[PDB]
Amino acid sequence: MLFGRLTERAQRVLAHAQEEAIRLNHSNIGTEHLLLGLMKEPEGIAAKVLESFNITEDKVIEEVEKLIGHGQDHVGTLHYTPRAKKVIELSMDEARKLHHNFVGTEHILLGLIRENEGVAARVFANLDLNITKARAQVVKALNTPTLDSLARDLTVIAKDGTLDPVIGRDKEITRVIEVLSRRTKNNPVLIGEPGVGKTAIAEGLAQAIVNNEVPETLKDKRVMSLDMGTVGEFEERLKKVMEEIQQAGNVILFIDLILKPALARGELQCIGATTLDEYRKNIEKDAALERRFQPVQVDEPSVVDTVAILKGLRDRYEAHHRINISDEAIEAAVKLSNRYVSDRFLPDKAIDLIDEASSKVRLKSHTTPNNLKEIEQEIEKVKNEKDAAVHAQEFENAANLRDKQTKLEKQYEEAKNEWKNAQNGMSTSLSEEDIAEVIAGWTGIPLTKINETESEKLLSLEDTLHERVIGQKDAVNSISKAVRRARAGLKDPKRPIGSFIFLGPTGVGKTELARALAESMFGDDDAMIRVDMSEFMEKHAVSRLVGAPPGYVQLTEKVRRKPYSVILFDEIEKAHPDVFNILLQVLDDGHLTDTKGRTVDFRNTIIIMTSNVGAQELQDDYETIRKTMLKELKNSFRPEFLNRVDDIIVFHKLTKEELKEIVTMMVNKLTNRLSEQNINIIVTDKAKDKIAEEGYDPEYGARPLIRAIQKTIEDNLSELILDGNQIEGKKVTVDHDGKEFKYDIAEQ
Amino acid sequence: PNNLKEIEQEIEKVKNEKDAAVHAQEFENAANLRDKQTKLEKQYEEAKNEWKNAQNGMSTSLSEEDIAE
Amino acid sequence: VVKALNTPTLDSLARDLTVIAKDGTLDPVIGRDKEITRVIEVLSRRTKNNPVLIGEPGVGKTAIAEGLAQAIVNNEVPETLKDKRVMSLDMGTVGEFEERLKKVMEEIQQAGN
Amino acid sequence: VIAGWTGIPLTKINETESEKLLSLEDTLHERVIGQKDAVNSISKAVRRARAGLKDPKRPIGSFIFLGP
Ligand SMILES: Nc1ncnc2c1ncn2[C@@H]1O[C@H](COP(=O)(O)OP(=O)(O)OP(=O)(O)O)[C@@H](O)[C@H]1O
Ligand SMILES: Nc1ncnc2c1ncn2[C@@H]1O[C@H](COP(=O)(O)OP(=O)(O)OP(=O)(O)O)[C@@H](O)[C@H]1O
Ligand SMILES: Nc1ncnc2c1ncn2[C@@H]1O[C@H](COP(=O)(O)OP(=O)(O)O)[C@@H](O)[C@H]1O
Ligand SMILES: Nc1ncnc2c1ncn2[C@@H]1O[C@H](COP(=O)(O)OP(=O)(O)O)[C@@H](O)[C@H]1O
């Protein structure tokens, strides 16, 4: 209700303020332009207020010109400063306070004086005029009682317009008014999980009533909602509400779960709000309500709709915080909130993030630049000295103290004015850097990962994986090339990011490769959901990872809280055949449905299945090996299951030269953990060869290497550490002389 | 059909301007506003009557395209 | 040396913290350098501007508000949070009790600080 | 003062926590006689977590006892 409340006189003032920026060569419309535009319209009520206060027009211009400056500007893009919209926001509040229904020129002056931060506020402040003095100047110069008492009305709240408008839910309003206009099943039921928005749906329907948007069929109908917090003694009160509604003919009920006769005859047009879990348990089982309800699919809005909602609601937050918000930050905040936070859905997680970012930047910017603190301390100490001198009957020093205090106060006022002029001159825009800092503190993701543009991360994936998984270039290149095709858009959007089958000897590094891929993609090492197929052997176990059937009492619950995770399966060849039917659905459709009816998404998860089959054949070119291993893979698996796999990964055996690099990587990783003590650890080539043959076993792979390192290097290092900081800040060298392990202690 | 919305907005803004002028102790400008509001109400009534007469004159029949949609 | 030298209703059941902090009789709140900033950050938001201290009893929750009032005397709070008295409601005081909060909440809104 | 709240003898509180872990093998053998490998393995495994070689988030250690 912006243009609907402004009168003809206010539009002239706004036009004058807009045209003043062109003459003043200002690219932004500040609070000073509104004051100048108001003095050029001596026809409204505000003219008489300033006339009685001995305030002319020429004095205001010369007073406001000194505070402001002059500079270059651009052509067009004449927007409003964040401080300027606060006056417009306060004018409506002032109009509502005085029991008025219009926004004229008499409210612009009142709103300009309540800012206390812009250029216009100081002009009134310097003329011994405050809010209290100007408040009285304009004032002196100027039915169904049971239902309305046992429930909460909605049209009354929407009539005043004190809440944010419902923007972006236009699709559901049309469906609701379409269902309400039907003859049979004219009682829509809002179906959706708690967290996507269901109570606010009726608020949007009620808002359109005031705007005269509903047709004549839905014209002049009050919206009433019956809360569940007010409920044998309560049954005597509901018998009269239904009778009152029937006699009125215009009351619309809104419930969230006796009333079977009321709904069978079409007497009450109630709107349900029950979730899908209870809809199939308290409504579908009853035939009386099955023929009178129409479910409506209500879910969270898409990413594009959230950007529009935030753009529509941008003006509201730019006034309470007085921080300019650019378009680049709005589109980034929604993406960041949808990427990391996955517990409250949309769009409630996109407004609080930008609100916190704006509050943080306003708090950081609105501080003292080490200028007023010293002056305030000097004023305080001078006042204390004067107070001490007064009680000491020392009037000789008090004369000098009073003059010093007056000079300090004058300097403090000048410094505050010159400090606030600079702050008013500049603009505090919001960028993605501020939002990244706020979002980093909620999950713990390092700032170096959030600021990534998701452009160089995929290109350097081959180098990142080799840091933790050395060797096996064929396995790394295949997955790096297969994961980027789905992200670019070459693959079907509904299918998951990728599906792979790990084959080869046990203990070769499949789990380490999965952990490295998860850390390099999602930025977290613990963002992996490990599902062990060893426990899924009987038919009764298939109801565990998909959901417990009703009447009796995993994967779906875990994947919902972490939509960005790598699913890892162990021993996929040992599982119940019914599990493959569930698994194929994930790869084909992309989403599952549990017993509660809630649908989980799998478009942001990498499915990795590890099988031990074919290990006995390798131990007895990469393309030839893949072709030979493919024939034996379908012998015990479904012929059509392997067609849905993006690629087959075959690992190779670990040679003698590859084992030295594993020990080197382990030593380097151990060194990083001792960064707090500044310990340098270096291992010679002889020691790496000596320790490699101790745990050399093709059956276990690199597993025996950890035990040898922990029993050889760590055991001797721990004793030296616990000798009273013997090697604190020094260099430790490990060299094998041939018989035992020689540890030489040096300096750093 | 994008006919009565503008007339309703004009009537609303004229009523709001008259209400603002009443509290401003400016009765000279309110005389024209009252006549303008009366003329706008008469025009709105005529436009609504002629719009609903045309709707009553015609009939809407369902086709196979609507069922398919 | 001696010879040679307001909202009263709202404050009836609540104790003002800044009055106690002005004299400096209690120990200064030193150590909560990250909680006062978080509280003043949450209080400066358009939505969800009512922070709630969550923690087990024994880590310190009532004393957190003392530090917020302490910064008022030291001129550390910004202009938005300048000259605002903080009152703590006593839970041990409580139909009969419903008539007292209505008068307190009306005065709190009118005071604005 | 702190000894009077838990009953811990003063000889136990006043320790540098540097020689107690080093002499853990001798201390355990006083009350447990035999099976030197089990005592040595746990004595070497428990001192690595306190030194800092083990991740701070994980606990001090985990052991599985097997045998009669
Ligand atoms: N390419 C590699 N380079 C260095 N170390 C590796 C490599 N592959 C595996 N490792 C090491 O293997 C060790 C064992 O890892 P983990 O216990 O996850 O088993 P795995 O070898 O992946 O086998 P499995 O698939 O049978 O569980 C890890 O500590 C890791 O350091
Ligand atoms: N190596 C040992 N040195 C000294 N005493 C020992 C040793 N092993 C066992 N004991 C003593 O044996 C006694 C009998 O209990 P024991 O330790 O044999 O069984 P346990 O380990 O407690 O049995 P369970 O496995 O059934 O719980 C104990 O009081 C213990 O002092
Ligand atoms: N059209 C909309 N635009 C922006 N935010 C909305 C819209 N509709 C609902 N919301 C948000 O949803 C929240 C209320 O959700 P609620 O109705 O409680 O969900 P549920 O009914 O599932 O508990 C409000 O805080 C509001 O910000
Ligand atoms: N910043 C601080 N520095 C030192 N001590 C503090 C600080 N904040 C609180 N305390 C201690 O906490 C105690 C009060 O705890 P209290 O708030 O009553 O805990 P709870 O609210 O859980 O009962 C005081 O005795 C005080 O010594």
- Give the Cα separation of A176 and A503 in Å (integer): 54
A321–C40 CB contact, under 8 Å: no
* B 28-47 near A (Cβ less than 8 A): none
Chain B nearest C-alpha distance from A80 (Å): 25
Q: Which residues of A touch D48 (CB under 8 A)?
A: 710, 714-715, 718
- Give the Cα separation of A340 and A563 in Å (integer): 9
**Burial class of residue A293 (count of CB atoms within 10 Å of its CB; 0-12, 13-18, 19+):** buried
D22–A711 CB contact, under 8 Å: no
- Tell whether D53 lies on the interface with A, counting CB pairs under 8 A: yes
- Tell whether A362 lies on the interface with C, counting CB pairs under 8 A: yes
- Give the Cα separation of A16 and A40 in Å (integer): 8
Chain A's closest residue to B29, CA to CA, is A43
- Give the Cα separation of C85 and C108 in Å (integer): 11
A215: left (phi over 0), alpha (psi -120 to 50) or beta: beta
What is the identity of the amino acid at A177? I
Q: Which residues of D touch A672 (CB under 8 A)?
A: none
HEC secondary structure over A670-739: HHHHCHHHCCEEEECHHHHHHHHHHCCCCCCCCHHHHHHHHHHHHHHHHHHHCCCCCCCCCEEEEEECCC
Encoded tokens for A15:
């036009």
Strand partners, A593: A599
A609: left (phi over 0), alpha (psi -120 to 50) or beta: beta
Residue numbers after which chain C is interrupted (C to N above 2.5 A) read 5, 94
- Tell whether A366 lies on the interface with C, counting CB pairs under 8 A: yes
C79–A366 CB contact, under 8 Å: yes
Q: Which residues of C touch A317 (CB under 8 A)?
A: 46
Strand, helix or coil for residue A591:
strand
Chain C's closest residue to A394, CA to CA, is C5
C41–A363 CB contact, under 8 Å: yes
Neighbouring residues of A92: CB distance < 8 A, sequence distance ≥ 6: A5, A103
Q: Which of A356, A332, A349 is nearest to A197 (CA)?
A: A349
- Give the Cα separation of A24 and B1 in Å (integer): 44
Encoded tokens for C100:
């007292």
Query: Is A511's C-beta closer than 6 angstroms to any atom of ligand 1?
Result: yes
List the A222-225 sheet strands across, edge first: A152-153, A222-225, A251-252
Encoded tokens for A741:
């392990």
- Tell whether B23 lies on the interface with A, counting CB pairs under 8 A: yes
Q: Which of A219, A217, A223, A184 is nearest to A204 (CA)?
A: A223
Encoded tokens for A281:
């348990």
What residue owns the CA closest to ligand 2's atom 8?
D32
What stretch of H or E contains A566? strand A566-570
**Ligand 3: residues within 6 Å at CB?**
A 166-169, 194-200, 309, 347-348
Q: Which of A615, A614, A610 is nearest to A572 (CA)?
A: A610
Q: Which residues of A touch B12 (CB under 8 A)?
A: 4
Of B9, B12, B20, the CB nearest to A104: B20
Residue pair A104/A45 in contact (Cβ under 8 Å)? The answer is: yes
- Give the Cα separation of A92 and B13 in Å (integer): 16
**Ligand 2: residues within 6 Å at CB?**
D 32-34
A-B CB pairs within 8 A amount to 22
Question: What is the stated resolution of the deposited model, in angstroms?
Answer: 4.4
| Ligand 3 closest atom vs CA A347 | 5
- Give the Cα separation of A660 and B41 in Å (integer): 93
Q: Which of C99, C18, C110 is nearest to C66 (CA)?
A: C18
Q: Which of A211, A225, A295, A289 is nearest to A253 (CA)?
A: A225
Of D18, D21, D53, the CB nearest to A714: D53
- Give the Cα separation of A477 and A626 in Å (integer): 14
Encoded tokens for A510:
């499949």
Residue pair A314/A325 in contact (Cβ under 8 Å)? The answer is: yes
Centre of ligand 2 from the C-alpha of residue A189, in Å:
68
| Ligand nearest to C-alpha C68 | 4
Residue pair A134/A37 in contact (Cβ under 8 Å)? The answer is: no
- Tell whether D66 lies on the interface with A, counting CB pairs under 8 A: no
Backbone phi, psi, residue A615, to 5°:
-70, -35
- Give the Cα separation of A169 and A201 in Å (integer): 8
- Answer whether the bond into residue A369 is a cis peptide, omega within 30°: no
- Give the Cα separation of A433 and A437 in Å (integer): 6
| Ligand nearest to C-alpha A170 | 3
Q: Which of A50, A248, A31, A266 is nearest to A146 (CA)?
A: A248
Neighbouring residues of D52: CB distance < 8 A, sequence distance ≥ 6: A673, A674, A676, A677, A721
- Give the Cα separation of A225 and A237 in Å (integer): 15
What are the b/e assignments for A598-622, b being 16+ CB within 10 Å? bebebebbbbbbbbbbbbeebeeee
What residue owns the CA closest to ligand 3's atom 12?
A197
Residue pair A202/A226 in contact (Cβ under 8 Å)? The answer is: no
What are the b/e assignments for A453-470, b being 16+ CB within 10 Å? eeeeebeebeebbeebbb
What residue owns the CA closest to ligand 1's atom 9?
A509
Task: Count how many Cα atoms sit within 13 Å of the Cα of residue D38 in the half-sphere of its side chain.
Answer: 11
DSSP assignment letter at A548 = P
| Ligand nearest to C-alpha C30 | 4
Helix axes B4-23, B27-57, angle to 10 degrees: 160
Q: Which of A473, A485, A493 is nearest to A646 (CA)?
A: A485
Spell out the long-range contacts of A141-146 with Cβ–Cβ below 8 A and sequence spacing 24 or more: A141/A45, A141/A48, A141/A49, A141/A52, A142/A45, A142/B23, A144/A241, A144/A244, A144/A245, A144/A248, A144/A251, A146/A237, A146/A240, A146/A241, A146/A244
Backbone phi, psi, residue C71, to 5°:
-65, -20
* CA distance readout (Å), C7 to A97, A200, A472, B8, C13: 22, 37, 77, 48, 12
C-alpha dihedral (A370, A371, A376, A377), degrees to nearest 10: 50
What are the b/e assignments for A362-397, b being 16+ CB within 10 Å? bbeebebeeebeebeeebeebeeebeebeeeeeeee
- Give the Cα separation of A106 and A117 in Å (integer): 20
* CA distance readout (Å), D20 to D38, D41, D53, D55: 19, 16, 18, 22
C-alpha dihedral (B49, B54, B55, B58), degrees to nearest 10: 160
Chains C and B are in contact, defined as 3 or more C-beta pairs closer than 8 angstroms: no
DSSP D34-46: S-HHHHHHHHHHH
- Give the Cα separation of C42 and A76 in Å (integer): 37
Say if residue C48 carries a ligand binding annotation: no
Q: How many CB atoms lie within 10 A of CB A748?
A: 11
What is the identity of the amino acid at A141? A
- Give the Cα separation of A469 and A417 in Å (integer): 62
A7–B16 CB contact, under 8 Å: yes
- Give the Cα separation of D62 and B17 in Å (integer): 81
Residue pair A576/A544 in contact (Cβ under 8 Å)? The answer is: no
Of A4, A102, A212, the CB nearest to B20: A102
Chain A's closest residue to B14, CA to CA, is A7
* CA distance readout (Å), A291 to A182, A188, A254, A305, A605: 13, 11, 18, 34, 40
| Radius of gyration for the alpha carbons in chain A, expressed in angstroms and rounded | 36
Say if residue C93 carries a ligand binding annotation: no
The distance of Cα A240 from the centroid of its chain, to the nearest Å, equals 46
Residue pair A186/A269 in contact (Cβ under 8 Å)? The answer is: yes
DSSP assignment letter at A539 = G
B9–A7 CB contact, under 8 Å: no
Q: Are strands A647-650 and A187-191 parallel, antiparallel or unpaired?
A: unpaired
Query: CA A386, A391, A397 angle in degrees (round to 5)?
Result: 40
Chain A nearest C-alpha distance from D18 (Å): 6
Strand, helix or coil for residue A406:
helix
Encoded tokens for D40:
């040595």
CA torsion sign for A318, A324, A327, A329 is negative
Chain A nearest C-alpha distance from B17 (Å): 6
Q: Which of A598, A613, A600 is nearest to A529 (CA)?
A: A600
Centre of ligand 2 from the C-alpha of residue A734, in Å:
41
Strand partners, A252: A223
